[PDB]
Design a protein around this ligand. Structure first.
Ligand code: ATP
Ligand code: ATP
Ligand code: LAR
Ligand code: LAR
Ligand code: MG
Ligand code: MG
Ligand code: MG
Ligand code: MG
Lengths: 361, 361
């Protein structure tokens, strides 16, 4: 009778119960199989030694359905320890998820896990809701994808969504590369996990990119120390802000794309004149890769440079924004008016999987 | 871009545009065909002379689909003069309408009249909404059927709906019968229309049934005069309140059913204890046959006799209650939140007619 909320990301699954303010289970979105029997999440991780690890979700889209069933089987029976036939399930999807994927998702829930009711919601919409608004533009930068999504009264505007395949995992690889400028090798998937850790702990977004580079090459006060697992210590300086600077200048990594400040602006510009002003004042950050200190001040300054000079620009960057999608679905799944909007097994029996596209809002 | 609202009753079609406070077209729900080429509504009526008249809706349910298409064709092209491919259409249905009927209704709208979007709503729910409430019990007595419908937050409670096949048309026939106690014959479908007219103009609900009969047989002050079309005049006395008294005592007409005060009570009693009190305080009358003067005071007194003696009983009987279903749909179709709940042609293409049962609320 409690609803389950499951948020499937490229990197992490966040799953739990509606009514909570945090996912009970967060675990790597991976399936592992013997190098020449399958393991999931945290499982797969303890034995990575003798497995090939596969990610079933790439850039926010489900591409391996057999593995995804195993992530879902693990989520219900091992992580949450519930019987799925007893619980309405809310699932999340990427903006612009293909219609065919969303139907396949519905079919699996109903025919393989026998849920009484499910729903599929766009991630960025749930994060807007978790901030208390129904109109806004969300910047959702996770592990695999970054999406700008303008939303008006609860409804995502498909023609103005921007997709940038440049996310947290790319920033980790770019940190690996530049650290092997001050002499370090990382290269293995294990050492990659170490650099991911450094990234999350030491990196930050510089208020002015150049001046910051001038500073780091004039005093040792930006260097920080970091202990590796083998005991050895490493020093990190200018790499701390150069790594995330990539989101503002993708040419750092050889991509020809606009940075996250320009896609935000361009997405606002694909909207009707009569709401632009509401979008400028309600930019919401969401996802793990928006956690860098300085990123929200940085965003404010860049978007004010591009927008008409009299526009009121406000960046909202809540402290819980790494889980905001999940918390959004926790709130939504608890509303009594949401209860009539679940897709029930009866509705699916009578109409089949394409029922899933009548969102009801 | 304006929505159409069409309310199909056993006797009258009420049709018009969302945003209005009254149906532009009210006309008899009849199809006429040459006694040995088809005519509708008011049409069929001017030539009844050489046609057989058929009612395609009986006791609120559509039973002749070919005729019903002609009522709908006439509604769009002759009465409202619009192109149906250009307008979302809201249709109404009886409580407990079979699933199969509602699908057939959807299929015709989409495949024969090519509407962009439609919706099918339960009549009694729209009348509740027109009174400004989302919780209440509606007594809807029309020409062909009477329905008691308890509704909690906008949703009709199917297991407590009561259906009584005793409505305005039966009261007309019973008035014909008792008038041929003071010497008058009516018998033909034309004279039936005359008695219907007398019914609507002269009849009323007595506050105490017996005392009223005692009164009419003690002074000529209750008789009223009525001019027939051929010039002759008729006198009506005790028949004025005996006719509608039938709704309270169906044995007047040989039926073994409970009266409208008992089905109301029984329907309230099939509900959960924790809302009964809200239903007792929000009884809404709706439909042509609730127009009799005195009926709402009458209802108050009868339901107070049956309910627990400390209950607060309130009867709401708005002046516009003969059109309240239509006005309900006029309001609903205008809400911006309703706009995402239309069934679109795309949704119907992908899922077919059984899409219609995902009500969204
Ligand atoms: N404090 C932090 N600073 C910078 N990055 C971080 C921080 N915390 C987590 N991240 C990064 O956020 C990413 C995980 O984020 P998230 O759970 O939002 O993504 P996801 O939903 O799995 O993937 P996606 O939305 O791309 O499909 C990882 O790359 C992780 O390193
Ligand atoms: N003032 C009135 N007093 C008594 N009865 C009336 C009055 N006005 C209309 N009626 C009756 O109301 C009936 C028409 O009501 P209405 O339009 O609500 O029914 P309907 O929707 O066609 O049919 P139903 O809901 O049974 O399918 C007719 O029987 C008509 O005689
Ligand atoms: C605390 C934590 C955060 C996280 O987000 O992990 C996701 C999950 C993960 C799966 C692969 C590795 C082997 C496995 C184990 C597990 C652990 C927990 C990881 O690979 C990412 O690391 C990629 C690689 S490098 C990067 O930047 N994203 C992001
Ligand atoms: C002003 C009006 C109200 C009405 O409700 O009519 C509906 C429609 C109607 C159809 C049959 C007759 C021949 C046709 C013509 C038309 C006219 C308009 C009628 O037959 C009813 O009369 C029945 C018969 S007797 C009664 O009580 N209900 C109710
Ligand atoms: Mg995500
Ligand atoms: Mg990879
Ligand atoms: Mg009616
Ligand atoms: Mg008849």
């Amino acid at each position: 009778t409690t609803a389950l909320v499951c948020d499937n990301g490229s990197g992490l699954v966040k799953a739990g119960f509606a009514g909570d303010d945090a996912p009970r289970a967060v675990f790597p979105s991976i399936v592992g199989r013997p190098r020449h029997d399958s393991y999931v999440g945290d499982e797969a991780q303890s034995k990575r030694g003798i497995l090939t690890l596969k990610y079933p979700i790439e850039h926010g889209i489900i591409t391996n359905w057999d593995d995804m069933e195993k992530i879902w089987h693990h989520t219900f029976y091992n992580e949450l320890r519930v019987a799925p036939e007893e619980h309405p399930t809310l699932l999340t999807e990427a903006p612009l998820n293909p219609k065919a994927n969303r139907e396949k998702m519905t079919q699996i829930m109903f025919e393989t896990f026998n849920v009484p009711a499910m729903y599929v919601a766009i991630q960025a919409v749930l994060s807007l809701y978790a901030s208390g608004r129904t109109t806004g533009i969300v910047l959702d930068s996770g592990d695999g994808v970054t999406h700008n999504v303008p939303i008006y009264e609860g409804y995502a505007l498909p023609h103005a969504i921007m997709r940038l395949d440049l996310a947290g995992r790319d920033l980790t690889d770019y940190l690996m590369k530049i650290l092997t400028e001050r002499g370090y090798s990382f290269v293995t998937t294990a050492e990659r996990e170490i650099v991911r850790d450094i990234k999350e702990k030491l990196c930050y977004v510089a208020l002015d990119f150049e001046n910051e580079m001038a500073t780091a090459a004039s005093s040792s006060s930006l260097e920080k120390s970091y202990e590796l697992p083998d005991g050895q210590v490493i020093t990190i300086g200018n790499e701390r802000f150069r790594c995330p600077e990539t989101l503002f200048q993708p040419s750092f990594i050889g991509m020809e794309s606009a940075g996250i400040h320009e896609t935000t602006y361009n997405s606002i510009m694909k909207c009707d004149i009569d709401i632009r002003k509401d979008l400028y004042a309600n930019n919401v950050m969401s996802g793990g890769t928006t956690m860098y200190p300085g990123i929200a001040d940085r965003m404010q300054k860049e978007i004010t440079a591009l927008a008409p000079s009299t526009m009121k620009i406000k960046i909202i960057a809540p402290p819980e924004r790494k889980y905001s999608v999940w918390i959004g679905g926790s709130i939504l799944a608890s509303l009594s008016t949401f209860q009539q909007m679940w897709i029930t097994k009866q509705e699916y029996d009578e109409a089949g999987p394409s029922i899933v596209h009548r969102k009801c809002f």
